[PDB]
C-alpha cells in the first residue's frame, strides 16, 4: 504494497481533494497549501497531454489505492468486457470491497477502509472477506462482523455519510451496521474532476 507515509503531500499535485485526510473537516487549510510538489514548484509551464495522461492515471490510482500491477489488470478486464472501457475501468474500481466500505460509510476513508476490511471486520454474506480487492456483485450485503461494532471509530466514521453527500446506489441500516450493494454506479454518479478516457489515451504510448 500500500502507499503509506505523508498524505498531506499527495493532494497538491493533481489538484483536487482526493479524500486522503484524518478527521472531521474538509480540504486544504492547516497545511498552508498553494503550491506544487517538486524540486522547485514556484514557476510552471506546459500542462499538456502525456504528463496529464499520466496525471490522470495517477490521480485515480491514489484515490483507490491500487498499484499499477492491479491497475493495469483493470485495463484488461475493461478491454475484455464489451463497450465503453473508460467506464468499465471505473465500475471495477467501484465494486472494490475496501471502496464499498467507504461508499457504505462504515469506514473513515479508503485507507482506513482498506485497513478495516483487512483486520477481518467486514463480512459480505455471513462470512469473512479480508481482501480489499473483492469485487462485489449487484445485490450483496456488505455487513460488519459483530466483534468490531463497539469500537467507536467505526460509528464515528458514519457521520460524513450525510456530510459528503448521499452516495445513492447503496442502502445502509445503521442499527446493525449492514449495507447492501444495490448496483454498480455508471458515469454520472462519479465525480467529474476525472477524465475517464485519458487513461485509454495512456496505453499505447
Amino acid at each position: 504494497a500500500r502507499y503509506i507515509g505523508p498524505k498531506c503531500k499527495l493532494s497538491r499535485r493533481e489538484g483536487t481533494d482526493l479524500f486522503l485526510k484524518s478527521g472531521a473537516r474538509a480540504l486544504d487549510s492547516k497545511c498552508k497549501a498553494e503550491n506544487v510538489p517538486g524540486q522547485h514548484g514556484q514557476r510552471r509551464g506546459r500542462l499538456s497531454d502525456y504528463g496529464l495522461q499520466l496525471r490522470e492515471k495517477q490521480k485515480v490510482r491514489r484515490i483507490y489505492g491500487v498499484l499499477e500491477r492491479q491497475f493495469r489488470g483493470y485495463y484488461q478486464e475493461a478491454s475484455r468486457r464489451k463497450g465503453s472501457t473508460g467506464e468499465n475501468l471505473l465500475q471495477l474500481l467501484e465494486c472494490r470491497l475496501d471502496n464499498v466500505v467507504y461508499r457504505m460509510g462504515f469506514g473513515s476513508t479508503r485507507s482506513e477502509s482498506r485497513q478495516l476490511v483487512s483486520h477481518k471486520a467486514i463480512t459480505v454474506n455471513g462470512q469473512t472477506v479480508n481482501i480489499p480487492s473483492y469485487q462485489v456483485k449487484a445485490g450483496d450485503v456488505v455487513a460488519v462482523r459483530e466483534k468490531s461494532k463497539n469500537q467507536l471509530r467505526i460509528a464515528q466514521a458514519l457521520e460524513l455519510c450525510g456530510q459528503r453527500g448521499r452516495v445513492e446506489w447503496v442502502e445502509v441500516d445503521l442499527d446493525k451496521k449492514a449495507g447492501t450493494f444495490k448496483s454498480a454506479p455508471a458515469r454520472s454518479d462519479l465525480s467529474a474532476d476525472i477524465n475517464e478516457n485519458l487513461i485509454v489515451e495512456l496505453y499505447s504510448k
Binding site: 463497450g83 465503453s84 478516457n197 489515451e201 499505447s204
Partner: protein
C-alpha cells in the same frame, strides 16, 4: 472551426552574406468535430506569430467531410508524394488508433473510430495532405448510380 490543434513546428533556415537567417514553420489543423477540417501552414521569425498564420490559413480552405457518424464511411487509402495513408472504420469502443499527424486531422473531423496507418513517408506535411485527400473523397449516399444501394 473551433478545436484548432497544432501538429508540428520546425526551425528552418536560410543563408545570406551574414549567415543563417531563421524562420519558424508551423503546421496546424483546424476543425469543429462535425466534419469540417482545414489544415494550414505559416511562417514567421517567431514561434507564435507563425502558429497564428497557421491558424489563419487553416480557417480558410476547409472541407466538408462526408462521414457516417463518428466513424469513417469505408476503408480507404490515399497518398500524396511518398506518403501513403490507409484509413478504415472501427466499431464503437475503439478510439483514434492511428497516430501522429493523422491523429490530429482524424480528431478535429469529429471521427473517433479510425484505425488508420501510414506507410512510406512519415513527414507530417505530406501525411496531412494524404489524410486530407482520403477524407475529401468519400460519399455515403452520393453515388450517382441511380439505386438505393
Amino acid at each position: 472551426g473551433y478545436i484548432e490543434k497544432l501538429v508540428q513546428v520546425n526551425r528552418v533556415a536560410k543563408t545570406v552574406k551574414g549567415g543563417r537567417i531563421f524562420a519558424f514553420t508551423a503546421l496546424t489543423v483546424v476543425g469543429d468535430g462535425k466534419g469540417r477540417v482545414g489544415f494550414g501552414r505559416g511562417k514567421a521569425r517567431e514561434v507564435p506569430a507563425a502558429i497564428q498564420k497557421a491558424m489563419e490559413a487553416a480557417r480558410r480552405n476547409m472541407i466538408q467531410v462526408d462521414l457516417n457518424g463518428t466513424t469513417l464511411q469505408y476503408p480507404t487509402k490515399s497518398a500524396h508524394g511518398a506518403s501513403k495513408v490507409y484509413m478504415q472504420p472501427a466499431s464503437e469502443g475503439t478510439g483514434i488508433i492511428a497516430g501522429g499527424a493523422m491523429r490530429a486531422v482524424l480528431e478535429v473531423a469529429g471521427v473517433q473510430n479510425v484505425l488508420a496507418k501510414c506507410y512510406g513517408s512519415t513527414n507530417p506535411v505530406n501525411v496531412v495532405y494524404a489524410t486530407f485527400k482520403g477524407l475529401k473523397n468519400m460519399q455515403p449516399e452520393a453515388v450517382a448510380a441511380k439505386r438505393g444501394k
